[PDB]
Every structure is written in structure tokens, then in C-alpha cells.
């Protein structure tokens, strides 16, 4: 083992980026989504 | 609207009430269904399957 400290600095903070991407896409889609869907239940209740 | 026709049916059961004048202008005709569509706002809650 051990000539793998340099590439661990460059792939980390890759892996952490992908890893945050994906997370701030799979929560950030559907929270819009959801923000949609409760203005549109709202305005057809308003509607009702 | 069964009851409307119970006077009438009496004034016309005495036809010696001279009908008063009325002034009877015919219904108005029932303003025509709103045709407002309820557009049934259909929430296609598409599940984006991420």
C-alpha cells in the first residue's frame, strides 16, 4: 500500500463532489416539485 | 314551482277576479347554465421517477 496518499487528496474531494451533486439533485428536484404540487392543491382548493 | 301554479289555478278557479292586469312580463328565462368549465385542475402528479 501507501503510494496512494497524493491520488486520495485528488479523489476525496471528487467523490465528495459528485456525492454532494447527487444529493443536492435528488433533494432540490422534488422540492420543487413539491412546491408545485402544494401551489396547485392550494389554488383548486381556492377554486372548490 | 308547484306551488306558483296553486293562485294561478285559483284565479283561474274565479274567473270573476278580472285578472288583474298583471303586468305579468314571462319569466326571464333561466340565465343559461354557467357554462364555466370546471376545469378540473387534473394534479398529474407526475412521479418523475428519478
Same mark, same amino acid.
Given at each position: 500500500w501507501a503510494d496512494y496518499v497524493?491520488?486520495?487528496? /485528488?479523489? /476525496?474531494?471528487?467523490? /465528495?463532489?459528485?456525492?454532494? /451533486?447527487?444529493?443536492?439533485?435528488?433533494?432540490?428536484?422534488?422540492?420543487?416539485?413539491?412546491?408545485?404540487?402544494?401551489?396547485?392543491?392550494?389554488?383548486?382548493?381556492?377554486?372548490? | #314551482?308547484?306551488?306558483? +301554479?296553486?293562485?294561478?289555478?285559483?284565479?283561474?278557479?274565479?274567473?270573476?277576479?278580472? +285578472? *288583474?292586469?298583471?303586468?305579468? +312580463?314571462?319569466?326571464?328565462? *333561466?340565465?343559461?347554465?354557467? =357554462? #364555466? =368549465?370546471?376545469?378540473?385542475? !387534473?394534479?398529474?402528479? =407526475? !412521479?418523475?421517477?428519478?
Amino acid at each position: 500500500w501507501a503510494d496512494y496518499v497524493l491520488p486520495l487528496i /485528488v479523489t /476525496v474531494p471528487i467523490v /465528495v463532489i459528485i456525492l454532494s /451533486v447527487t444529493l443536492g439533485l435528488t433533494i432540490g428536484i422534488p422540492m420543487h416539485r413539491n412546491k408545485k404540487a402544494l401551489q396547485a392543491g392550494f389554488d383548486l382548493s381556492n377554486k372548490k | #314551482g308547484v306551488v306558483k +301554479k296553486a293562485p294561478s289555478a285559483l284565479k283561474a278557479a274565479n274567473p270573476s277576479v278580472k +285578472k *288583474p292586469a298583471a303586468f305579468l +312580463k314571462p319569466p326571464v328565462q *333561466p340565465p343559461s347554465k354557467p =357554462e #364555466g =368549465e370546471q376545469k378540473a385542475v !387534473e394534479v398529474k402528479s =407526475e !412521479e418523475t421517477k428519478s
